[PDB]
Structure formats: structure tokens, C-alpha cells
């Protein structure tokens with residue numbers, strides 16, 4: 545009976561992830577695939593409120609989109625953009641490591657998401673390959689804003705008790721993509737803590753001089769000597785082969801609304817377009833937010849803006 549409300553809107557499928565859990569599901573009104581993050585309230589908690597509040601406020605081409613927050617006596621449900629491509633983590637593992645060229649393709653997407661997160665006044669604080677998914681177009685989507693304002697990924701000053709720390713974590717990520725293993729690792733947490741504080745890591749033979757130089761700028765122990773996010777957007781390495789800076793500004797507006805989506809919702813709601821717009825622009829992350837955003841996603845995927853009434 546904890547699933548009663550949910551089953552009004554979505555048809556559930558197989559659980560894909562466990563231990564929060566994650567279920568694949570279909571949104572009935574649009575027919576769009578989603579992923580539903582299911583969390584127990586008793587067996588847990590403000591970590592969830594943190595995240596939900598973050599995702600309500602963040603909207604971006606490289607952030608896994610929150611469509612819908614449902615809450616029951618026992619459960620909390622988060623209906624999220626469906627990323628069939630799987631984790632960045634598993635993809636590195638299959639390839640062993642990424643080429644510099646492929647690392648750059650991926651890394652630009654990470655910078656874009658993180659630069660935007662910082663622009664909105666947040667720090668992610670838990671950046672790692674497990675927190676990055678590929679959508680059906682092999683585009684990166686950032687997840688899990690629960691620790692936002694993994695020891696392997698933590699900046700020295702964070703460990704010692706905000707946006708500088710993210711730059712450091714992006715550095716570790718950069719290293720992992722190109723190397724296939726951590727720059728700092730150890731069985732023992734305090735030994736790891738010490739390696740991180742010292743800041744010395746193996747520099748593998750296959751890294752280009754330009755890779756090594758970027759790594760060295762991002763992985764500065766002193767946060768004040770560390771490349772800033774602004775300077776990362778147009779770093780020589782980042783610009784290689786692209787010749788334009790990372791486009792970090794969000795498409796996916798809060799203010800501009802899609803006319804076709806407004807129209808189809810208007811006919812469902814049997815109201816006029818101005819009423820429908822005011823209603824959408826409250827962004828309450830109820831079924832309306834879900835349906836609007838899912839109609840928009842239907843449209844981007846080149847499908848007709850159509851509800852199933």
C-alpha cells in the first residue's frame with residue numbers, strides 16, 4: 545500500500561539498483577521511461593531533503609533531471625531521468641581506461657555540469673564515476689546531490705574540516721578516466737588520508753604532457769594554488785580539438801516554457817494557456833511537473849507532444 549500513489553502515475557519494472565533502491569518504470573501519461581529512486585523513512589534522512597531541494601533548484605543538460613517527488617508515511621519516491629547507458633564507473637572498467645580524446649569528450653560534460661552547479665550557489669561534494677550516468681545518446685548525467693552544500697575523491701581541505709573541493713574531485717576523476725585506477729589509494733583510511741595530504745601520485749607513461757600539466761593544476765593540495773573553475777572552462781587541454789570553451793550554461797530553462805507542451809497540457813486541463821503557464825511555473829515537482837518535463841523530453845527525442853488520456 546506504500547506503492548498505491550506511485551502506481552497511479554507509473555507502471556513499475558525491474559529494480560536495477562539496490563542498497564535507496566532504484567526501479568525502472570514507465571510514466572503512463574507520456575509513455576516515457578523513468579527511473580524511480582525509492583527510499584525508506586523509518587530505516588533512516590535530511591540527506592534526502594538536501595538532495596531533493598538541490599535538484600528542485602538545479603536544471604541542466606548534464607544533470608539527471610528530477611521529475612516528481614512523492615511521499616508516503618513510509619516511503620519517499622524520486623522520479624528521475626532515465627539513463628540507460630549505465631555508470632561512468634562500469635564503462636572505465638570495461639575499457640580499462642579512456643584515451644585522452646575520449647576522456648576529453650566526457651570530461652567537458654562533467655565540467656559543464658559542475659560549473660553550472662557552482663553558478664547556482666551549490667557544491668556537489670561527492671563527485672566520482674559512480675555519480676555519473678550515460679543517457680541513451682551517451683551523454684553524461686550527474687546524480688546524487690545528497691552530500692551537497694569517496695574518500696579517494698575528497699580534497700585535502702575537505703577532509704580536514706566548497707567549490708575548490710569539487711575541482712580537486714574532478715582532478716581525481718580526470719586521473720581515473722585516463723589511467724583506470726586512483727591516484728591515491730590504500731587499504732587503511734588514515735594511510736589514504738596521508739597520501740592525499742602529501743599529494744604525490746604515479747604519473748603513468750601513456751599520459752601526454754598536456755594531460756599531466758592539467759592534472760597537476762587540479763590536484764594542488766593547497767586550494768588557493770589550484771586552478772579555478774573559471775580557468776578550467778577554457779584550459780588549453782579542455783580546448784584541444786574543440787577550440788571553444790565548455791558551454792556550462794543551462795539549456796533546459798525554468799522561465800521559458802515550451803508552447804507545444806503548454807498547449808497539450810491546456811487541452812488536458814481544459815484551461816487557457818496563461819492559466820496553464822502559471823500552473824507549470826510553480827514547479828511543485830508533482831505529477832504536473834513530471835508530465836510537463838516528460839512531454840518536453842518526448843519532444844527532444846523527436847516524438848510527438850502527445851498525452852495518453
Ligand SMILES: NCCCNC(=O)c1n[nH]c2c1CCc1n[nH]c(Nc3cccc(F)c3)c1-2
Nearest residue numbers: 560561566579608624625626627628630674688
Ligand atoms: N552514489 C550512489 C548513487 C545511487 N544511485 C542512483 O541513484 C542511480 N543509479 N542508477 C540510476 C540512479 C538514479 C537516476 C537513474 N536513471 N537511470 C538510472 N540507471 C539505469 C542503469 C541501467 C539501465 C537503465 F535503464 C537505467 C539511474
